[PDB]
């Protein structure tokens, strides 16, 4: 019944980069293929005077043969015609860390409590996403209040992802 075409997904009306700035703790993640950020994931968003949004992120990543490292990542956002949809160029402070460019959508936020982010890296031929990821962020590292949690679950369902998240732990690893 429900529409899982990426082109159908609503995103945050009138998204305000300035209001979104500061520290966001990842509470939950839906992983893409070949997942990178594992846990202890914390993002820091900024906007400069030209209106350009950027971010940094810290988190544990586990490169194969199970060698744990705290990745330190950088992202810069190019605006599109939709104020809530961006192209995110990203890299690690270390050369060998994963680099790339992903769509970055702010699906919903109330700026001071919760945010839902979404990226489709590759479409299916029917317009659904073949390879997606999604973060749920909280301003409080101890989690969302119930009213926000309930809104977020609705958005997760609207993205056709609600069954596919895992919780992100924070335990000072970094
Ligand atoms: C999506 C992060 C929010 C802002 C932080 C962007 C700074 C670089 C983030 C790198 C994330 C790229 C990896 C996401 C997919 C994954 O973790 O498996
Ligand atoms: Cl609930
Ligand atoms: Cl579920």
Determine contact, residues 27/153, Cβ cutoff 8 Å.
Answer: no
- By the 10 Å C-beta count (0-12 exposed, 13-18 middle, 19+ buried), 125 is classed as exposed
Residue of 27, 30, 57, 92 to mutate, ligand 1, most atoms within 8 A of C-beta: 57
- Cβ-based neighbours of 52, under 8 Å, separated by 6 or more: 76, 77, 79
- By the 10 Å C-beta count (0-12 exposed, 13-18 middle, 19+ buried), 137 is classed as buried
Experimental technique behind these coordinates: X-ray
Task: Determine if ligand 1 sits within 6 Å of the CB of residue 86.
Answer: no
Report residue 134 as tokens.
Answer: 């999604």
The third-level CATH classification (topology) of the domain covering 1-174 is Lipocalin (2.40.128)
* CA 166 to chain centroid: 13
Q: How far apart are CA 126 and CA 131, in angstroms?
A: 13
Residue of 58, 64, 88, 102 to mutate, ligand 1, most atoms within 8 A of C-beta: 88
Q: How far apart are CA 162 and CA 158, in angstroms?
A: 8
């Amino acid at each position: 019944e429900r529409d899982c075409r990426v082109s159908s997904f609503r995103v945050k009306e009138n998204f305000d980069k300035a209001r979104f700035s500061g520290t966001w703790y990842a509470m939950a993640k839906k992983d893409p293929e070949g997942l990178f950020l594992q846990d202890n994931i914390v993002a820091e968003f900024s906007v400069d005077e030209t209106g350009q949004m950027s971010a940094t992120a810290k988190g544990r990543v586990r490169l194969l043969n199970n060698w744990d490292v705290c990745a330190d990542m950088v992202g810069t956002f190019t605006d599109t015609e939709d104020p809530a949809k961006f192209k995110m160029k990203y890299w690690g402070v270390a050369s060998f860390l994963q680099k790339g460019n992903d769509d970055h959508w702010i699906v919903d936020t109330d700026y001071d409590t919760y945010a839902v982010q979404y990226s489709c890296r590759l479409l299916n031929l029917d317009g659904t996403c073949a390879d997606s990821y999604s973060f749920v962020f909280s301003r409080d590292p101890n989690g969302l209040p119930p009213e926000a949690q309930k809104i977020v679950r609705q958005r997760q369902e609207e993205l056709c992802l609600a069954r596919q998240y895992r919780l992100i732990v924070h335990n000072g690893y970094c």
